[PDB]
Amino acid sequence: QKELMNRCGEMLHIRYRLLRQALAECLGTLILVMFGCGSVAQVVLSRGTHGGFLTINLAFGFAVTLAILVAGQVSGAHLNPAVTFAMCFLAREPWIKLPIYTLAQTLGAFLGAGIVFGLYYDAIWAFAGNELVVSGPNGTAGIFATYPSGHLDMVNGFFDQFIGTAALIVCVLAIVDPYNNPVPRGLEAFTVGLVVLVIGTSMGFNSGTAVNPARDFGPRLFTALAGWGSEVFTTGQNWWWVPIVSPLLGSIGGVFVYQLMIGCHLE
Amino acid sequence: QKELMNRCGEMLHIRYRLLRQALAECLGTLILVMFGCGSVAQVVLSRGTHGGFLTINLAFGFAVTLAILVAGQVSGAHLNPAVTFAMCFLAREPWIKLPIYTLAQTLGAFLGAGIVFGLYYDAIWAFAGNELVVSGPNGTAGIFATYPSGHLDMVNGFFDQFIGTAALIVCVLAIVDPYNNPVPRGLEAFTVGLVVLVIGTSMGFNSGTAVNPARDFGPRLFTALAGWGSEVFTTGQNWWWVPIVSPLLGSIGGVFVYQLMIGCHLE
Amino acid sequence: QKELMNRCGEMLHIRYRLLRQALAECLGTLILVMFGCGSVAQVVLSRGTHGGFLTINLAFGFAVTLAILVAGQVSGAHLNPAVTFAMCFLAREPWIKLPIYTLAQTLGAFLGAGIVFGLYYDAIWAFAGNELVVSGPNGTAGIFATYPSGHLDMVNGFFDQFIGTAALIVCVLAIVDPYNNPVPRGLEAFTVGLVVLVIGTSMGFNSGTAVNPARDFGPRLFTALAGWGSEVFTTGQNWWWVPIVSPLLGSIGGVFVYQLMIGCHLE
Amino acid sequence: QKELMNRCGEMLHIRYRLLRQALAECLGTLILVMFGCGSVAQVVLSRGTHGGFLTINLAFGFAVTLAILVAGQVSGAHLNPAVTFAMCFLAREPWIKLPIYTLAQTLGAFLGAGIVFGLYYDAIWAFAGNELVVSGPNGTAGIFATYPSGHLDMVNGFFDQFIGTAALIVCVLAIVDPYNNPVPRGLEAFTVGLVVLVIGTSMGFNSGTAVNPARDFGPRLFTALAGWGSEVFTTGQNWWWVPIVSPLLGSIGGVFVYQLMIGCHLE
Numbered sequence A, B, C, D: 001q002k003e004l005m006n007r008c009g010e011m012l013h014i015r016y017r018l019l020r021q022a023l024a025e026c027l028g029t030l031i032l033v034m035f036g037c038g039s040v041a042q043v044v045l046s047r048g049t050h051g052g053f054l055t056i057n058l059a060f061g062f063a064v065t066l067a068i069l070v071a072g073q074v075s076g077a078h079l080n081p082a083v084t085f086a087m088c089f090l091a092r093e094p095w096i097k098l099p100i101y102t103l104a105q106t107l108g109a110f111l112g113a114g115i116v117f118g119l120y121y122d123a124i125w126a127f128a129g130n131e132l133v134v135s136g137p138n139g140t141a142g143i144f145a146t147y148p149s150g151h152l153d154m155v156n157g158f159f160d161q162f163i164g165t166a167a168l169i170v171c172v173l174a175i176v177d178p179y180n181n182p183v184p185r186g187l188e189a190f191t192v193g194l195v196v197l198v199i200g201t202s203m204g205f206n207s208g209t210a211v212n213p214a215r216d217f218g219p220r221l222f223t224a225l226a227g228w229g230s231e232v233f234t235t236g237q238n239w240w241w242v243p244i245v246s247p248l249l250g251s252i253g254g255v256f257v258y259q260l261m262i263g264c265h266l267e
C-alpha cells in the first residue's frame, strides 16, 4: 500500500516553486477565512448565546497560527496583501510575486466564505426569515465582510485600518526580523497569532477585524453573488474600498515607524 | 521503599506493544471525554452562571493537549477514529490497529461519561426534578452526546461534521508531517490543542463539538443505559449515526485537500 | 554599589537545603493563593461586572505557572500536599519533608489570604454593609475557602475532590515522568498551568476549585480569626474536612490509575 | 532596489547605545499603551457589547509580550519605571539611565494615548453627546488613565498599587534571574505576558490595571490637554500621584520579599 501512495506522490509533483507557493497561499487564506468568518457566524446567528466578541478574537488570532503552521515552510504564509507589500518593499522578496500572491490570496478567501456559507446554510437563511439582508437587526452580510458601525464616519474609518495595519506591520516585522531574535527561532507561528489576537480586542469595534485586503474583499465578492446583491458594495457610502486602499498605505506606514527606530539601529 | 516500588513495576509489565498502546488510548480518551463533557455540564447545569460557551471551547481545546501529553509517547494519542483512519490511509500505520484503537477509544470514552455522571450526580438529577429528559428546556442528555439545534436539518447536519473533520485533518496532518516542520519538534501537543479550540468557536453552533466518532457515540451509549432510555438514539430523526459516518468520510476528505496542495509538493 | 549588594548576599545565606526549599514553598503557595483568591474576590465583590467565572479559571490556571517559575528550581513547587503525597508515595522524595512542606504550604496559604484581605479591605466590608457573613446573597467567606452549593450533598461532595485530585495527579505525573517526555524538557511550568485551568472549567461548579488541602484549609483558618467567626467551619455540615481528607485519598487514586496503565509500561 | 535599502540603513545609523535603547523604550511603551488603552475603549464605549473585562486582561497581558518582542533585544523592554527602579536597585543596570528610560517611557505612553484617541475619535465624542466628562455614567477619561471606584478610599488605594507592583516584581525578578532558570531561556516574552495577565484578573477591580507609573501618568497628561481639562488631576482627592509614588515604593518592596527568600539562597 505504501508503494501506491508513493507512486501518486510522484505523479502530481510540480517542480515550479512559484506555483507551489501560490497553492500554499490559497490554503493558508482558506483556513484563516473559514475559521475567521465561521466564528463571526457563531456569535451573530446565535445572538450571543454561543459566545461573545471574545470568541471572535480568540478564533481569528489562533486561525493565523494554524494557517502559518500549514503553509509557513512552503511560502511563509503572508495571508495579507499588506504584509506581502511590506516584504517586497524591504527587498526581502521579489515584486513579481506581489500580484501572484494577491490573486492566490483573494481567491482562497473567496472559497473560505463558500465553506462557511455551506456550513451555516439553514442558520443564515432562517436568521432573517428566508431573506438575505446586508445589515441591520437581522443583517447577515456582516459575517463575511466588515461593515462600519453607526458612529463611524468616512474620515476616521479610513484611519482605523491605517492604525490597525501599521500596528500589525511593526509587530510582524520585529518577529520576522533576522537581526531581532528575542525568542528562540521557530516560534513565528505562535508570536504572530498573539498579534492578530490583540488587534481584535483593541481596534475591533469601529468596523470589525479586517486589517487585510484579502480577508475583507475576498468574501465580500462572494456575498454579492450569493443572494445579498449589489447592496453589499454601496453600504455606508461605498465602504468596500476603504479596507483595501487604507491597509496598503498602512503597510508602508509601519515600515517607516519600525525601521526608523529599531530596524535600522541593529547589528 | 524504592525496592518495593521497583518490584511492582516488573510484576505487571507487559511486553506486547499493541496492548500497551491500547491502554494508553483508553486513558487518552478518558481524559479528553471527562474534561470535555465535564465542562459542558458546568455551563448547562448552572444555566450559564459558571461560564458561557467559551468555557467549553477552552476546556475541549486544552483537554486534547493534556491527553496527548499523557499518552503521546506510548501510542501517539489519536483520540479520534477519523484521525486513526487518516494515518492508516497514508500507510503511516498498519490497518490491523484500526479496530483495536477504535475499541480502545469508544471504550474509555464510555468511561469518561461515567466519571462525569458520578461527579455531577445531584446536579443532573435535580436539574429537571428527579427526572431525566434527553433534550429541551430541562434537557440533560446533551451534556454527553451532541444533538442538533432546531434550525438544523439532516442534509446540512451531515456536512457540518464533514467540514469540521476535514478542517481538523488538514491542520493535524500539517503538524504531524515529517517534511513540514515550521515549528520546533515536540510542540505537537500544544499545536493540536489550538486546532480543537478554534473548531469549537467556529463550527460549534449547529450541533456542538463532536468531530470524533468516539467522543460522540462513546458517552451516547452510556446515556442510553443511565436512565435516559431509547429516546437518545431516536432524537432528531435518528441523529446518532450522523456524527459517526460523516467524520469517517471527512477524514479522507482532508487528506485529498491537504496532500494535493501541500503534502505532495514537499521535499 | 555592586559590592554592597554582594556583601548582603553572603550575610543571609543559609547552607541548609531543607530550609531553603521550605522558604520557596511559602512563596510558591503565597503567589498561588493571592492570585487565586484575589481573582475570586474580583468576580464576587463586583457581582460579575469585572468578569465571570472564566476569569477565575484563567487566573487560577496561570497562577500555578507563575508560582512554579518562581520556586520550581529551588524545590519543585509542589504547592499541594496531595501532590507532595504522591511524590513521597513513589519513592521520588523522602517522607521526612512531607510534614515540612505541608507546614510551609498551609502557612503561606494563610498569608495569601492576608494580602487579599488587605487588598480588598473596603470592598469586603462594604459588600454586606459593615458586616461579615460566611455565605448567602451577600456572603464573603466564599472568596478564600470553597463552600458547597445548594444542590451538593455530603456523599457526592466527597467524590468531587477525589475525582478532581485524581485527574490532577494523572496529568501531573505524566508531565513530571522522566520516562515520559512528549514535549521538550523545561515546559513543566506551562503544561501544569493548563491542567489546573481545565480543572476549574470542568469540575469547578459543585463547590469551587480547591483540589489542594493547603489552598482550602489555609485561607479558611484566616477567615475564622478575621471576623467571620466559627460559622466558617460548621457551614454545610462540617464541610471543612472534606477538601482535606478526600484529596489525600485522591492522590493515591491517581497513582494507581496512571501507573497501572502508562507509568509501569514504559522503558 | 536592495542597494537603495542598504544605503538608507547606513545614513540614519547612530552609534550611541544609550540613544538606541531610549528609542526602543518609546516604541515598547507606545505598543503597550495603544493596545492597553485601546482595549479599554472597546469595552467602555461599546457598553460591554464588544467584550467584557476579560478582554482588557487578555489585551493588556499580551501587549507586554508583543512590546517585549519588539524591543527586548535592544534595551530589555522594561516598560515600567518601577521595573527599571528594581534593576538599578540590584546593580544590574547603571543609575544614569533611570531618568533617561523614564523620560522615554512617559513620552511614548503619551503618544500611545494620541493614537487611541485618533482611532476612536467619533466614538469618544459621541459617547457623551459631543462633550467630554472625566468619570460617571458617561465618563470617558477612564479609558486612558485609571480612576478609583466608589468604594475605594485613599489609604487602601495606596496599598493596591503597592501589592500589585510587589507581586509583579517578584514574578519578574524570578524570570529575569540568571541563576533561576526553570524554563528554557528566550521565553521571557511569554512568561512576563502571563504575569501582567493575572494581575488584571486578580487586582484590577479597585481602580484598574496601572501597576506602572508611565502607563498611568503618561496618557493622563494627554487627557488634560485633549479637552477633559483640569478635572482629570483633581478627581478622587488628587488621585494622580497615587499610581506613581506607590509603585515606586512597591518595586523595592518586591526585591526584599523575593531576594530574602529565593534570590539570595541560590547558587
Ligand SMILES: CCCCCCCCCCCCO[C@@H]1O[C@H](CO)[C@@H](O[C@H]2O[C@H](CO)[C@@H](O)[C@H](O)[C@H]2O)[C@H](O)[C@H]1O
Pocket: A060, A064, A074, A075, A076, A077, A078, A079, A080, A083, A087, A092, A093, A172, A176, A188, A192, A196, A209, A210, A211, A212, A215
Ligand atoms: C485578519 C487578518 C489576519 C492577518 C494575518 C497576517 C499574518 C502575517 C504573517 C507574516 C509571515 C512572514 O513570514 C516570513 O516570510 C518571509 C518571506 O520572505 C520569510 O523569508 C524567508 O523565506 C523566503 C521564501 O519563503 C525567502 O525569499 C527569504 O529570503 C527568507 O528570509 C520568513 O522566513 C518568514 O518568517
Ligand SMILES: CCCCCCCCCCCCO[C@@H]1O[C@H](CO)[C@@H](O[C@H]2O[C@H](CO)[C@@H](O)[C@H](O)[C@H]2O)[C@H](O)[C@H]1O
Pocket: B060, B064, B074, B075, B076, B077, B078, B079, B080, B083, B087, B092, B093, B172, B176, B188, B192, B196, B209, B210, B211, B212, B215
Ligand atoms: C472533540 C474531539 C477531539 C479530537 C482530537 C484529535 C487529536 C488528534 C491528534 C493526532 C496525533 C498524531 O500523532 C502522530 O501519530 C503518529 C502515528 O503514526 C506518530 O507516528 C510515529 O509513531 C508511530 C508509532 O506511534 C510510528 O508507527 C510511525 O512510523 C511514526 O512516524 C507521530 O509521531 C505522532 O505525532
Ligand SMILES: CCCCCCCCCCCCO[C@@H]1O[C@H](CO)[C@@H](O[C@H]2O[C@H](CO)[C@@H](O)[C@H](O)[C@H]2O)[C@H](O)[C@H]1O
Pocket: C060, C064, C074, C075, C076, C077, C078, C079, C080, C083, C087, C092, C093, C172, C176, C188, C192, C196, C209, C210, C211, C212, C215
Ligand atoms: C488550586 C490548586 C492548584 C494545585 C497545583 C499543583 C501543582 C503541582 C506541580 C508539581 C511539580 C512537581 O515537580 C517535580 O518535582 C519533583 C520533586 O521530586 C522534581 O524531582 C527532582 O527534583 C527533586 C528535588 O527538587 C529530586 O529529589 C528528585 O530526585 C528529582 O527528580 C521534578 O524535577 C519536578 O518536575
Ligand SMILES: CCCCCCCCCCCCO[C@@H]1O[C@H](CO)[C@@H](O[C@H]2O[C@H](CO)[C@@H](O)[C@H](O)[C@H]2O)[C@H](O)[C@H]1O
Pocket: D060, D064, D074, D075, D076, D077, D078, D079, D080, D083, D087, D092, D093, D172, D176, D188, D192, D196, D209, D210, D211, D212, D215
Ligand atoms: C500595565 C503595565 C505593564 C507592565 C509590564 C512590565 C514588563 C517588565 C519586563 C522586564 C524585562 C527585563 O528584562 C531584562 O532586562 C535586563 C536589564 O538589565 C536584561 O539584562 C541584560 O541586558 C542588559 C542590557 O540590556 C545588561 O546591562 C545586563 O547586564 C544584562 O543582564 C535582561 O536580559 C532582560 O531579560
